[PDB]
């Protein structure tokens, strides 16, 4: 929870790849490359692509909103993307995505196949 500090304070600064953040349990977590191939569908996943250039790296902070989390959850993943946008150095960008908006855009950053499991991993609700 709160990627900032343990995340926004050290995102991608020298590595070609994209990192996401699982908004499971209605919160957030640093999704590494060992699990960026299957993200629940009914949730939110903040992404952060980083490419190289003739000067530095071009970051891209996206916010996936698998229409399932509560309204605030949509403001939690999108807000985390707004905090890493200025913390990255203003070099990152902002993008919008959803369970029906991350079509070729999300798959675009993922050259393989994206999966979508269930949401609410607390199994303690209804």
From Swiss-Prot:
Protein name (Swiss-Prot/TrEMBL): Villin-1
First and last residues shown, out of full length: 2 to 127 of 826
Tissue: Specifically expressed in epithelial cells. Component of brush border microvilli.
Each Gelsolin-like repeat, start to end: 26-75
Domain notes: Consists of a large core fragment in the N-terminal portion and a small headpiece (HP) in the C-terminal portion. The core fragment is necessary for both actin-nucleating and -severing activities, whereas the HP binds F-actin strongly in both the presence and absence of calcium and is necessary in actin-bundling activity. The Gelsolin-like 1 repeat is necessary for the actin-capping activity. The entire core fragment is necessary for the actin-severing activity.
Stated role: Epithelial cell-specific Ca(2+)-regulated actin-modifying protein that modulates the reorganization of microvillar actin filaments. Plays a role in the actin nucleation, actin filament bundle assembly, actin filament capping and severing. Binds phosphatidylinositol 4,5-bisphosphate (PIP2) and lysophosphatidic acid (LPA); binds LPA with higher affinity than PIP2. Binding to LPA increases its phosphorylation by SRC and inhibits all actin-modifying activities. Binding to PIP2 inhibits actin-capping and -severing activities but enhances actin-bundling activity.
Compartments reported by the entry: Cytoplasm, Cytoskeleton; Cell projection, Microvillus; Cell projection, Lamellipodium; Cell projection, Ruffle
Organism: Gallus gallus (Chicken)
PTM notes: Phosphorylated on tyrosine residues. The unphosphorylated form increases the initial rate of actin-nucleating activity, whereas the tyrosine-phosphorylated form inhibits actin-nucleating activity, enhances actin-bundling activity and enhances actin-severing activity by reducing high Ca(2+) requirements. The tyrosine-phosphorylated form does not regulate actin-capping activity.
């Amino acid at each position: 929870v709160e990627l900032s500090k343990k995340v926004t304070g050290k995102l991608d600064k020298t590595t070609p790849g994209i990192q996401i953040w699982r908004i499971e349990n209605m919160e957030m977590v640093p999704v590494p490359t060992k699990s960026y191939g299957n993200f629940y569908e009914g949730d939110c996943y903040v992404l952060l692509s980083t490419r190289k250039t003739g000067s530095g790296f071009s970051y891209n902070i996206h916010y996936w909103l698998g229409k399932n989390s509560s309204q605030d959850e949509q403001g939690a993943a999108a807000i985390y993307t707004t905090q890493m946008d200025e913390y990255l150095g203003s070099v990152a960008v902002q993008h919008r995505e959803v369970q029906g908006h991350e079509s070729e855009t999300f798959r675009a950053y993922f050259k393989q196949g994206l999966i979508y499991k269930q949401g609410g991993v607390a199994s303690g609700m209804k």
